[PDB]
Every structure is written in structure tokens, then in C-alpha cells.
Amino acid sequence: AITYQHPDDLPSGVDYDFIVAGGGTAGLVVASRLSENSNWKVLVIEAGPSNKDAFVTRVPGLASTLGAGSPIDWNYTTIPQDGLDGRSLDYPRAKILGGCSTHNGMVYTRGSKDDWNSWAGIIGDQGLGWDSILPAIKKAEKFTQDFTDQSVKGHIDPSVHGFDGKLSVSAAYSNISFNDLLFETTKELNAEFPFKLDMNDGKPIGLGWTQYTIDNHAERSSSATSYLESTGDNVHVLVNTLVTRVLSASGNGTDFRKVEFAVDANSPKKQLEAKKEVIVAGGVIASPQILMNSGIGERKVLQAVGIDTLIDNPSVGKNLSDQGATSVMFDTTLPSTDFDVDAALTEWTNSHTGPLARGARLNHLTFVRLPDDKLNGQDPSSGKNSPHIEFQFAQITPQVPTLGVPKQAPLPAANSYRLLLQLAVVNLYSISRGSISLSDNNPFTYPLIDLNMFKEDIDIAILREGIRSAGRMFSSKAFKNSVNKFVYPPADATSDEDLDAFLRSSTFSYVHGVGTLSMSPKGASWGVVNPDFKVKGTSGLRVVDASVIPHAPAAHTQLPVYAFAEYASALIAKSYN
Ligand SMILES: *Cc1cc2c(cc1C)N[C@]1(O)C(=O)NC(=O)N=C1N2C[C@H](O)[C@H](O)[C@H](O)COP(=O)(O)OP(=O)(O)OC[C@H]1O[C@@H](n2cnc3c(N)ncnc32)[C@H](O)[C@@H]1O
Ligand SMILES: *[C@@H]1O[C@H](CO)[C@@H](O[C@@H]2O[C@H](CO)[C@@H](O)[C@H](O)[C@H]2NC(C)=O)[C@H](O)[C@H]1NC(C)=O
Ligand SMILES: *[C@@H]1O[C@H](CO)[C@@H](O)[C@H](O)[C@H]1NC(C)=O
């Protein structure tokens, strides 16, 4: 691809077959795949800068520095969340080529087979069901040895991995005692915490070694590095440029093959017309905003901010499915995972080794299925193979963290711990659906984000049980004297009431949002896109990104986005023969 820093740098007289709005995770898959046809020309318009020389984004262990408040973040926050003591939550999202694949924690999780089968059923397309989609996921994957060629025997099952694809996946790990204490806990508490060889086999329940989108040179593998980099000159990428609206090519029709864009709110709007289609790939937050600012949305909402409704679809921006999470911290006497970061960065720079080479400071995920009697409501999961709860072990540190700790969350008593074991406990199937709406009709104004956190009681109840589950893991015989009492929440906070009060102050968003432009069958009474990814009621316009995925999986969402984007790419290309 050729990257252009400003619209005036674009070459004159070029007509593009496809224009992709959002050079993110999905957007770069689509642009890169469609460009495989040498006769097609593809323009990507991306709000952020190029990922090139975005140095910190290359370093896997610096990922934790890239969320809310970072130089590359959108700095989205939510409306006050009345289920969380009125708190406004951050909603970290990357503003940069590759989108969230450039800034995320690199976790590679496919979700359970039930998730894919659930989506397949809702959408009415069995091509998205597990048996049908798994081969495509493998084809898209390039699992690799890490830079140091560490043995991952017994850490993954090569059976479920592709080795020849686009997106690099690896599983480098530190050699720490915690690893063995976790494994021995699986023998003690095997009913709740069995060992899981490969959580990407469709059945993720258990304790698994984490897999990451990290290449063979200990650099982040993003959609820019995996897909865009190898493309030819028929891909043009315009960065630092906001798509403001999509527009009718005919002017009174719903053939939304035109895009409008501008470099800032005080600059000239420019327009281009795609010969075939505009593919909106702005992600779960931005794609609904682009569509609403284009007149595609809930008429009353649009009217109230001065936008003429061209397509009245009240599902636009609705059904935001994400995951609520809290940190939990235990007193521990285990060795810290901390290190001198400057020193480690010099090491990564000089040798591509050291802790910054790895995707996290601990090496495992746990996926826990709660029994029916610890579900205070109907089971919200996709099926029997699906976990309700994730543990994402973060670090061991004598310093109380700010990451994963909301601003006014009470901190553990200094004297209550030696070191802290921090992990996130995530309610993977948080049923309370949120929304994206407009404050005004200016595309440069951020949209209103509601996560509707804890509207449904099952969501906080599941998280409470997730905390209790963590308590059981670190109560194992293996862990005795190594990992001791809870300190966040306090050890004395044991009741439903007391954990709920803790959760209102401690819960934040896991930012695995999907669903705001939901895919539904053609003729369904709700949703925004048909199974062909086309916006209902339009021509020349598709949405391909997390917004179409009907509900969040039991997983981190990058892989599902890549796999939807690959699925869309294939069918778009096919439609033009
Ligand atoms: C931000 C974030 C995401 C995630 C994690 C951590 C952080 C802080 N960690 C993860 O859990 C991880 O470890 N593993 C994962 O599987 N998932 C993680 N994760 C979420 C994941 O990255 C995310 O769901 C997925 O990447 C979403 O992809 P997609 O739907 O394609 O959205 P983006 O990648 O955000 O791309 C949108 C793209 O669009 C640009 N943009 C937005 N609005 C405009 C306009 N109007 N015009 C032009 N461009 C626009 C964005 O800047 C972006 O590049
Ligand atoms: C959010 O998604 C749900 C589907 O999961 C939609 O629920 C459907 O709503 C229609 C229209 O009222 C009903 O006919 C269906 O029976 C519902 N299906 C299910 C599974 O509940 C819902 O309409 C979506 N909401 C919005 C605003 O888009
Ligand atoms: C997000 O805030 C950070 C910290 O102030 C800043 O560096 C960055 O430019 C902000 N993002 C945007 C889109 O302005």
C-alpha cells in the first residue's frame, strides 16, 4: 500500500472501486483482501496516523501503556452509568492505522463453538457456524515460534492452528513459579479449573496458556502489519482524515457509494465516489456515528440534532454488547513481575528479548463455567461449552496499580499485603445492552456512549460469583501461604451486598464491544445489516467490523472481528466474480 498523510497528497484521476472508512482491525482485512484483485483500486480513510514509526505500538509489553489517556487513544468516555454509582467509564479505543489491533493486549481467543453457532443461528448463515468457520480461521492464522524459539509443547494444540496465514500468533512465556502453582491447582480443583491445552479448540473452559498476536520477531502483529504491509500499490491509505458521512451517489437515492471526509472541523469537506461500494469499518463506536450523521438511524434521535432521516432504522447504535470486568487483588508472597521498564525497553530494542517481548506479565487465562445454581437468572452464555467468567491474570507487584482500578475505587490497605496478585475477573456474557447516540450533528463531536452497566441483576451477580470463584482458585492447596487473602475487595467484604458495593466502584469496561449495527436476517424486524454485510435499505454500502457481530463472545474480540472481516471479504469479492 501507499500511505498519504493528507488528502491533497492523493493522486489525481484515480477512481476507487472500494472505499473503506476506518483503517482498523476489520478495515485493513477488507482493504487488503479486496486488493488481491490487481484490477481493483482501494482507498482506506483512517482518522489516526500511520502505525509506521508508532514505536511504542510495536513493543508487546508496552501495550498496557496505550489505553485511556494515551497519545493514540480516542479518549471516549461514557455517559454517567447509573448502575455504577453514576461513574463515567473510559472506553479506550485506538485512533491509528490498524485500530484496536495496534493498541490491544494481543490476546488471541476465538470464543467457544457455541458463540459461533449462536451467531450462525441468529444471522441464519451456517457459514459462520463453528464447523464452517474454523477452517477459515486456521487459514487466516500464522502460528509461529516466538523469537527465542521457546518450546510451546503442552501449551497449545498445533492441531487447531494454521501456520501459513496472515495474522501471527505466538505463545512466549516467562518461567515463574506461578505457572506451576496454577497447573497444580488444576489437579486439585479439576472440576472447576481443569487444565485446557488449547482454549482455541472451541471449548475454552479451564486454565490455558495465553496466545498472542505477536510475531516471530517479538513485535506486535496488527492488521496493519499482517494484512496491509504486503499489499501492492492498488491500496491507497489516507491517514489523519475523518470520514464524516456516507452520501447517496444519485442524490435522492439510498445508493451510499459516496464518502465525505475532512482533516478537522475547520477544514473543507471533500468527497469521493466508490465505483462499487463503501465499506464502513469504524468499529463499534464510530460506525453507528457515521451512519447516524449520514441520515441512517432512529428518526427522532436524528431529528432532535438537526439531521434529515434518509433511512429510519431504530436499531442503529443499539444493542451494544460488551463485558463488565473488575480487578481483584490478593496478598501474595510470590516474586513480583515488575522490572525496570526503561532497562527492559533497551533490552527489547537491543535484542528483542526480555519481558517486553511478551504479551503479558503473567502467562495464562482461566475460563470458568458457573453451575446453574450460581446463576441468578437465566443462563446468559451461548451454551454448555461456554464460560461465564474469565480470569486474566495481570501481574504481581508490591505497588498498588492504577491500571484496572477506577478513579475513586478504594485501595487495599498498605499493611494488608506484601505483594499484590492482580487479575481481572470478566463477566463475558453481560446481558445489559448499551447504545451509541449523538450529542449533535458534528462528526467531530464524540458520540454518547452508554454501556447500560448492571441494568440487569444477573450481570453484577455473575461478577460476584466470579470473584468467589477466584477465591476458590487461590485457596487451593498449591497456593497455600503463597497467595493469601483478598485485599481488593477487602477480605471482610463477603456478602452479596458488600461485593455489590465494591463492584459498583470497581467495575470497568473490557472494551470488547460488538452489536451496534447488528447483523440480522434479511426481513428481520430489527438490526442494521443483512448477512451479506449490506446496510438494510441501501445499495453500495456495507459495514464490516465489530458493530455487526450480534453479541459479545466468551472471548476477547479481535479474532472474531478478523474472522468476520475475512468472511465479508470473501463474499464481497465473490459478488463481483
Ligand atoms: C483498545 C483495546 C482493545 C482490546 C484490548 C485492549 C485495548 C485497550 N485487548 C483485547 O482484549 C486483546 O487483548 N485481544 C482482543 O482480542 N481484543 C482486545 N481488544 C478489543 C479488540 O482490539 C477490538 O474489539 C477489535 O480490534 C475491534 O476492531 P474493529 O471493529 O475493526 O474496530 P477498530 O480496530 O477500532 O477500527 C476502527 C478504525 O476506525 C477508525 N475511525 C473511527 N472513526 C473514523 C472515521 N469517522 N473516519 C475514519 N476513521 C475512523 C479508527 O481510528 C480505527 O482505526
Ligand atoms: C436488539 O437485538 C434483539 C435481538 O437479539 C432484537 O430483539 C427482537 O426485537 C424484534 C422487534 O421488536 C422482535 O420481533 C424479536 O422477537 C426480538 N428478538 C429477540 C431474539 O429478542 C431487538 O429488536 C434489538 N433492538 C434494537 C433496538 O435493535
Ligand atoms: C487523548 O489524550 C491524550 C492525553 O492527554 C492526548 O495525548 C491525545 O492526543 C488524546 N487523543 C485525542 C484524539 O485527542
Numbering used by the authors: 1 to 577
Source paper text:
Here we report the crystal structure of AmPDH (the translated product of pdh1), refined at 1.6 Å resolution, featuring a C(4a)-modified flavin ring. The observed value of –152° for the N(10)–C(10)–C(4a)–C(4) dihedral angle in the AmPDH adduct agrees reasonably well with those generated by DFT calculations and with the synthetic flavin O-adducts, but is distinct from the modified flavin in AgCHO. This is confirmed by the tight association of His512 Nε2 and His556 Nδ1 atoms with the C(4a)-oxygen species in AmPDH. This distance is considerably shorter in the two sugar-oxidizing dehydrogenases that are unable to react with oxygen (∼3 Å in PDH and CDH), and longer in AnGOX (∼5 Å), which reacts readily with oxygen but does not form a C(4a)-flavin intermediate. At this point, we make no claims that the flavin C(4a) adduct is a functionally relevant intermediate during the oxidative half-reaction of AmPDH, but rather, an artifact arising from attack by reactive oxygen species on the C(4a) position during irradiation of the protein crystal.
Pyranose dehydrogenase (PDH; pdh1 gene; pyranose:acceptor oxidoreductase; EC 1.1.99.29; sequence UniProt: Q3L245_9AGAR) from the litter-decomposing fungus Agaricus meleagris (synonym Leucoagaricus meleagris, Agaricus praeclaresquamosus, California fungus) is an extracellular, monomeric flavin-dependent oxidoreductase, with one flavin adenine dinucleotide (FAD) prosthetic group covalently bound per polypeptide chain. Like several other fungal sugar oxidoreductases, AmPDH belongs to the glucose-methanol-choline (GMC) oxidoreductase family; and as the fungal pyranose 2-oxidase from Trametes multicolor (TmP2O), AmPDH produces aldoketose or diketose derivatives from non-phosphorylated sugars.
